[PDB]
Amino acid sequence: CNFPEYELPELNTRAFHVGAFGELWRGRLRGAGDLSLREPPASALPGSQAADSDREDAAVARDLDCSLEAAAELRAVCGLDKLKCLEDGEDPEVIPENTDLVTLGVRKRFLEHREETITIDRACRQETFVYEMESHAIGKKPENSADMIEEGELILSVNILYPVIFHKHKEHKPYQTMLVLGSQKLTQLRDSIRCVSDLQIGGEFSNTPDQAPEHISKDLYKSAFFYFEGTFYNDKRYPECRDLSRTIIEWSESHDRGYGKFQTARMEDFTFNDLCIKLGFPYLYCHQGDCEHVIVITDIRLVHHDDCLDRTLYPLLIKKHWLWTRKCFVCKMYTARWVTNNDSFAPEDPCFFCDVCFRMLHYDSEGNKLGEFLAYPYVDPGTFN
């Protein structure tokens, strides 16, 4: 049955149907209310539990099959005064010395060698994006009723890798993490992508630099498809969209290329609940016909009242890797906007130029072409990352 298990330790899991998995999760939670989106009561010190005692002791007695006095005794025993070694007025910026923790000892070792004038700072720890996009959306609610997450809705964590891979490291990957709902279709995920592959442009305009093409790649081609468990999900909402998967099925199935039989289907025909997908196992998405993306279902879980309940942000970005700007070779500090080939002035081919370093170098006051070269408008993937 749909019983998640590790195919490999902490790397990937077995395949299961998302809808059946969500139904199983709800069946173990429906009626209990632990999957609800309403704020429940929270634990407190025994000196203030009197107000909540009336509402809590009876339920505790019912669930634990103990007496009301036994429930009160358990509540008094399990009070936070027995656990709160830290008072509520203590700042987290200083290590409490009255401790026996090895973890805090290692923390002290880390902090002591970062207090010198050369080392003391409040800079980034190891990354910044995750908390910034968590606190910006965690615990919030939408301004419109139609943008309400359904109670018990599945939350799927999807990692989309960039087209610019390091091709020098293999442990870590360049990717951005998108959160999607089970009921959502793949169309809303595809339309939410802001990859630079949608912004690609071209054309040789060394003679007339001001005649750059009017239409970006997104305005000329709209082909995009997902690929899960051997199924292609190709967009066809627009005439610019083409079923790219037919060429792949023609090429691959004609020979033993190392992959099995595939099937073709439209992009809007399936929701995230209809997928039978693995977790952690990479999958394929493609758009523009040459921009492939690695798709990893990192995590899946039911919605929680403390999560982002605002659907206007969904698909919600939570994590993102960084790409560095491609800067021109003239001033070696400004991000390039043009690329040239066969350039007599440039020391190397290809050479990257910024608008400032491009126009006045390759043209005079009247804009007349100088020297021999070919020029193309350039969009930096490291900028629009």
Positions that interact with DNA (CB under 7 A): 121, 123, 324-327, 332-333, 382
Instruction: Give me the least distance between CB of 330 and Zn ion, in Å please.
Output: 6
Residues 6+ apart with CB under 8 A from 131: none
| Sign, CA torsion 296/299/303/304 | negative
3-state class of 314 per DSSP?
Answer: coil
| Cα–Cα distance, 227 to 295 (Å, whole number) | 9
Cα→Cα distances 383→24, 44, 334, Å: 44, 48, 11
Using CB under 5 A as the binding criterion, the count of chain residues that bind Zn ion stands at 6
Picked from DNA, Zn ion, none, the partner binding residue 195 (CB below 5 to 8 A depending on kind) is: Zn ion
Instruction: Give me the least distance between CB of 352 and DNA, in Å please.
Output: 9
Q: Which is nearer to Zn ion, 305 or 359 (CB)?
A: 359
Q: Does 336 bind Zn ion (CB under 5 A)?
A: no
Instruction: Give me the least distance between CB of 336 and DNA, in Å please.
Output: 9
**For helices 50-64 and 68-77, what crossing angle results, to 10°?**
120
Q: Does 267 bind Zn ion (CB under 5 A)?
A: no
Give the DSSP H/E element, type plus range, for residue 265. strand 263-266
Picked from DNA, Zn ion, none, the partner binding residue 382 (CB below 5 to 8 A depending on kind) is: DNA
Picked from DNA, Zn ion, none, the partner binding residue 324 (CB below 5 to 8 A depending on kind) is: DNA
Instruction: Give me the least distance between CB of 327 and DNA, in Å please.
Output: 3
Q: Does 375 bind Zn ion (CB under 5 A)?
A: no
| Half-sphere exposure for 141 (CA within 13 Å, toward CB) | 9
DSSP letter (8 states) at residue 41: P
Picked from DNA, Zn ion, none, the partner binding residue 327 (CB below 5 to 8 A depending on kind) is: DNA
Residues 275-294 close enough to bind Zn ion by CB under 5 A:
291
Residues that bind Zn ion (CB under 5 A): 195, 197, 291, 354, 356-357
